[PDB]
Amino acid sequence: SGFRKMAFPSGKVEGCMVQVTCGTTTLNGLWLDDVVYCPRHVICTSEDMLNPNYEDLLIRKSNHNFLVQAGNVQLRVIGHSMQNCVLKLKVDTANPKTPKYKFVRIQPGQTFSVLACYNGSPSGVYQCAMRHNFTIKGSFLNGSCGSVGFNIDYDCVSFCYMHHMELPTGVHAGTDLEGNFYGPFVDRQTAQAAGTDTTITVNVLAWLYAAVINGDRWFLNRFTTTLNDFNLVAMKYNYEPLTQDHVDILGPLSAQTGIAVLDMCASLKELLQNGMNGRTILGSALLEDEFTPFDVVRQCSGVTFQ
Amino acid sequence: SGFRKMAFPSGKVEGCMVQVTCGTTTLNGLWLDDVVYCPRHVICTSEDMLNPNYEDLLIRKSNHNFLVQAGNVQLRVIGHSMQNCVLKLKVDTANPKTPKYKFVRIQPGQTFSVLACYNGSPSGVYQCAMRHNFTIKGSFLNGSCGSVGFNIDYDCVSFCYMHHMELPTGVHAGTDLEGNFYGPFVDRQTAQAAGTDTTITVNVLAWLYAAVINGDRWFLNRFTTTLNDFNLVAMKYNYEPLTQDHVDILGPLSAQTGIAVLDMCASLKELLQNGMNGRTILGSALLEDEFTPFDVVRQCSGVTFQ
Ligand SMILES: *[C@H](O)[C@H](C[C@@H]1CCNC1=O)NC(=O)[C@H](CC(C)C)NC(=O)OCc1ccccc1
Ligand SMILES: *[C@H](O)[C@H](C[C@@H]1CCNC1=O)NC(=O)[C@H](CC(C)C)NC(=O)OCc1ccccc1
């Protein structure tokens, strides 16, 4: 028993991280087969960051201007192209450590592990969620761009995120591996607004099920509710409206615990309206929303990877 | 910016995990050079767990009774011995993936990454602290024993923990890699008492410095205090007494932030006496104590590993 914010094992991704330097700017790239993916802002100078014309900037760049380093070994760049906000640097050597992989664009509420890197070397690994305002709450310093977010299913790495920037609120924004930003964000140094940060209701519910499984049950109350009645309380607390799909997704945890989804909704309503009265649930003094139903089953049933 | 419970990258340790089976019991072993380390309870049956005589049980065991599997490949066991609560299974093949490593016995308040494994395969990675009562707050199911806790300094893996058991309180106990338990715990299925769980004061202070660095400053107040005056308030809230060594350890964060350690103590005193009034510090609604001063500098300055 016990419940922790658990990241995927990072080894398969560690073997894909390289360093990409263009002039004075150094960041991280992802080396899959004979291609290195990195943020296109690698080509920017301190001047260029306010309002870069990425097309004009890139024209002044040839293959030999991209220094690509795997450990202490230099890769030879034989091609380069821009896809949305990422560069694809074609190298003459296939990564011998390429795992089975997919590029996936994930949905708000879904979670992933981040391998934070500097100069193509791993610093650390942590779990994040794509929030409803298409931000993540990460830990990123200068040089961290090109750090990736991923899931593992068995032996397959699903890359969903590449790090590009930090907003005024101290939260983080980036792209899928096709270089399309999550949310309305653009890769230029201008004040950009994350909108309302709504709580991922289905994920809070998942986590209350995790708590019940681990013997933390104080908050189970005597009431039930309806989707429409629960959602009136959700709107007030900036919670995502609960839908029958969410109820269906919680079906296995509901069936495992014998606690009906709408009875757990009723418990959640009283926690939102009454607070926690100085108590904790799974060692937490607020309602956690960065565990999916899948994450809870995965953690509470010991699912493993290659 | 931003601050997360960050684990070390796990790849170097992933390549050391094997599966160890003795009769019907399967758990994880650590394969370093030509030696596999695992919990000695691998030799127990369901009967044996209440009051095992480990010496008598082991006598009925030969090399060929220990099935050691690295992925889908069988290792040949050419020797076996008990060291305290671990078995060392000598194999005829040196692990080709052995990293540079040390066995360290860590001190309460120190933190480490756990690679939770089942059947010798990684499930996930998370950060833990050795608590003052020599327990950890992990996530462990049946089959997780032999999972290890570690730190990385550059290219060297320092193994500090091997998982053996869960107490009534839902917290976790285990050994160093010499097989000596942290705390008074023994490897038998009997109600065992973790004592008072004191908060790691120096670690709370470290985390308040992390908060100030990341722009969360609401809790900085107008007061200072003395070690003796602070510690009177610590004892009441079951906080570890603060010492000049702790003050010295916080010296770099104090010097970086220009907030004197005893002024931060005064801020901590008011948080303990007044609570947080429904506010958060670095997204947390309680005082976090599983970040060391080193962890804070490491995270806030981007220290990387091989
Ligand atoms: C990529 O290495 C870098 C990551 C930033 C640096 C601080 N925290 C992060 O997440 N990205 C940028 O510097 C980005 C570049 C533009 C061309 C998009 N600009 C940015 O994020 O501006 C905010 C900022 C910069 C430096 C320190 C703190 C915030
Ligand atoms: C090692 O695989 C296993 C880990 C336990 C299982 C549940 N959570 C854990 O951390 N250790 C044991 O089963 C241990 C064996 C003795 C010979 C020391 N006994 C134990 O931890 O008893 C408590 C327990 C067992 C099963 C489920 C929940 C609690």
- 């890197």: which residue's tokens? A117
Q: Estimate the share of chain B in helix, then strand, then coil, as percent rounded to the nearest 5.
A: 25, 30, 45
Report whether A51 contacts A159 (CB < 8 A). Answer: no
The contacts of residue B79 (CB under 8 Å, 6+ apart) are B63, B88, B89, B90
Six token digits for residue A306: 């290659």
Across the interface, of A4, A10, A304, the residue whose CB is closest to B118 is A304
The contacts of residue B294 (CB under 8 Å, 6+ apart) are none
Q: Give the residue whose CA is nearest to atom 5 of ligand 1.
A: A165
**Pairing of the two strands A77-83 and A100-103:** unpaired
Which residues from chain B sit within 8 angstroms of residue A278, using beta carbons?
A: 275
Experimental technique used?
A: X-ray
CB of A246 shorter than 6 A to ligand 1: no
CB of A41 shorter than 6 A to ligand 1: yes
- The rounded Å distance from CA B69 to ligand 2 centre is 22
The contacts of residue A273 (CB under 8 Å, 6+ apart) are A233
Residue B151 C-alpha from the chain's centroid: 9
A vs B: CB pairs below 8 A: 156
Ligand with an atom nearest the CA of residue B146: 2
* B positions 240-299 inside 8 Å of A (CB): 275, 278, 280, 283-286, 298-299
Residue B161 C-alpha from the chain's centroid: 6
- 């694809």: which residue's tokens? A88
State whether A125 and B7 contact (CB < 8 Å).
yes
Q: Cβ atoms within 10 A of the Cβ of A252, count?
A: 14
Report DSSP letters for A188-252, one per residue.
Answer: SSS--------B-HHHHHHHHHHHHHTT--TT--S----HHHHHHHHHHTTBPPP-HHHHHHTHH
Q: Which fold has domain B11-91?
A: Thrombin, subunit H (2.40.10)
Give the three-class secondary structure for A94: coil
Report DSSP letters for A121-184, one per residue.
Answer: EEEEEEEEE--TTS-B-----TT-TT-EEEEEETTEEEEEEEEEEE-TTS-EEEE-TTSPBSSS
**Which one of B145, B160, B163, B164 is the catalytic residue?**
B145
Six token digits for residue B150: 């570690």
Q: Does domain B201-301 have CATH number 1.10.1840.10?
A: yes
- 């998982």: which residue's tokens? B163
Give the three-class secondary structure for A1: coil
Phi/psi for B201 (5° steps) reads -45, -55
Q: Is B156 a catalytic residue?
A: no
* A positions 61-100 inside 8 Å of B (CB): none
Phi/psi for B195 (5° steps) reads -85, -155
Q: Give the residue whose CA is nearest to atom 29 of ligand 1.
A: A166
* A positions 161-190 inside 8 Å of B (CB): 166, 170-172
Give the three-class secondary structure for B34: coil
Ligand 2: nearest atom to the Cα of B172: 10
Q: Cβ atoms within 10 A of the Cβ of A251, count?
A: 11
Q: Give the residue whose CA is nearest to atom 6 of ligand 2.
A: B142
Q: Is B160 a catalytic residue?
A: no
Burial of A208 (0-12, 13-18, 19+ CB in 10 A): buried
Ligand 2: nearest atom to the Cα of A1: 8
